[PDB]
Design an enzyme around this catalytic site. Structure first.
Site, PDB file in Angstrom:
ATOM      1  N   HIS B  36       0.901  -1.332   0.092  1.00 49.30           N
ATOM      2  CA  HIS B  36      -0.218   0.038  -0.086  1.00 49.30           C
ATOM      3  C   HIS B  36       0.909   1.349   0.021  1.00 49.30           C
ATOM      4  O   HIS B  36       0.236   2.414  -0.169  1.00 49.30           O
ATOM      5  CB  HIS B  36      -0.970   0.025   1.060  1.00 49.30           C
ATOM      6  CG  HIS B  36      -1.491  -1.206   1.572  1.00 49.30           C
ATOM      7  ND1 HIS B  36      -2.182  -2.193   0.822  1.00 49.30           N
ATOM      8  CD2 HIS B  36      -1.290  -1.976   2.774  1.00 49.30           C
ATOM      9  CE1 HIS B  36      -2.339  -3.070   1.384  1.00 49.30           C
ATOM     10  NE2 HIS B  36      -1.961  -3.337   2.576  1.00 49.30           N
ATOM     11  N   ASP B  58       1.627  -9.849   1.117  1.00 50.38           N
ATOM     12  CA  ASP B  58       1.684  -8.205   1.325  1.00 50.38           C
ATOM     13  C   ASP B  58       2.775  -7.681   1.759  1.00 50.38           C
ATOM     14  O   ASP B  58       2.842  -7.172   2.896  1.00 50.38           O
ATOM     15  CB  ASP B  58       0.376  -7.902   2.091  1.00 50.38           C
ATOM     16  CG  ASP B  58       0.227  -6.226   1.976  1.00 50.38           C
ATOM     17  OD1 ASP B  58       0.879  -5.561   1.963  1.00 50.38           O
ATOM     18  OD2 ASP B  58      -0.854  -5.723   2.398  1.00 50.38           O
ATOM     19  N   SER B 110       2.137   2.060   8.566  1.00 52.80           N
ATOM     20  CA  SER B 110       2.383   0.673   8.206  1.00 52.80           C
ATOM     21  C   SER B 110       3.797   0.586   7.856  1.00 52.80           C
ATOM     22  O   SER B 110       4.554   1.442   7.315  1.00 52.80           O
ATOM     23  CB  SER B 110       1.526   0.403   6.961  1.00 52.80           C
ATOM     24  OG  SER B 110       1.681  -0.707   6.169  1.00 52.80           O
TER      25      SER B 110
END
Lengths: 48, 159, 159
Positions: B36, B58, B110
């Site tokens: 992301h 991810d 993150s």
């Protein structure tokens, strides 16, 4: 003096090729699905 | 106080829009960064380093050059019960789940690593879901066999 | 000492025509309400939850919302012999049975989680009976494998 069918003159060897190619088409797919399921189960078992 | 002084410069923010949106960390000889986050690593040498995609886990991972393998985080496979150090504050590992106090952690945080009291990385976060008075974390850690179990809570809000 | 185990707001009363007849308790992200107790939970968010019955074990369970999962009791799979804490008073575990002093537990004292000396729930009591000169409690506990075994004395008296 007779009547013919669509599968009358295929002969055994053409059946052999058609079955091996179509059957082999299905066998490799079945192997792929089996491997995918096996590795999915193995990955799920790896979760701690 | 005791949790904030555990500061390491190995983490590198990702730069795009000219603002911070996530952190990428070098652990055990591999550079990790989430999906992301978009942009280039602050370190130019790692910014120009090619990355390999792992979408289902991810995290893009990249092979660090051999020279920089000396200075990197130490991975951990054991996760004893209880509190752990972090950039913000103490993170409680309970019932096989990492949790943080209310409000701590938001967008742009993150990719930060959760370390232990020893001073080495034990896991890395990719997102957080607010469960109420205590907030759970979407985090990926390391096992004794190195199978990299990923723990993703239900309907987790992505950071 | 005993007063440090009654500051648990996570328990909830059951209202019937303005009276109390039972308690619904939340443990491990699941809300348990005794089946034989009729009424409505005072909390609106928990009352609106749809619960799934369990006639054999005599309690209905529901899945609490995500925002409520944080503040919730913690269950224990080990039940060492001896002392235990309860809101009414001390309880004692012998040979797989909970026992309380005389006259403890009556109409409206079901769904009470029997806390441990650590401060976390080990079982939920649904009723108690006094046979001969000893009083025992019908109670549902949790095994090490998580099978939710229930122990009920003979001729158990409700609540």
């Amino acid at each position: 003096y007779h009547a013919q069918t669509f599968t009358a003159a295929v002969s055994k060897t053409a059946w052999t090729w058609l079955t091996s190619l179509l059957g082999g088409s299905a066998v490799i797919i079945i192997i792929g699905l089996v491997l995918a399921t096996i590795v999915a189960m193995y990955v799920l078992t790896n979760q701690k | 106080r005791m949790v904030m002084k555990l500061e390491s410069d190995k983490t590198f923010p990702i730069m795009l829009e000219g603002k911070i949106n996530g952190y990428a960390c070098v652990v055990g000889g591999k550079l990790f960064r989430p999906m992301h986050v978009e942009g280039k690593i602050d370190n130019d040498v790692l910014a120009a380093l090619k990355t390999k995609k792992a979408s289902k886990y991810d995290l893009e991972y990249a092979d660090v050059p051999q020279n920089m393998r000396a200075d990197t985080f130490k991975y951990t496979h054991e996760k004893p019960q209880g509190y752990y150090s972090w950039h913000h504050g103490a993170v409680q590992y309970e019932n096989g789940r990492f949790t943080v106090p209310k409000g701590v952690g938001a967008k742009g945080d993150s990719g930060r690593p959760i370390l232990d009291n020893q001073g080495r990385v034990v896991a890395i976060v990719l997102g957080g879901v607010n469960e109420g008075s205590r907030t759970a974390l979407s985090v990926v850690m390391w096992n004794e066999k190195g199978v990299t179990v990923k723990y993703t809570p239900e309907n987790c809000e992505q950071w």
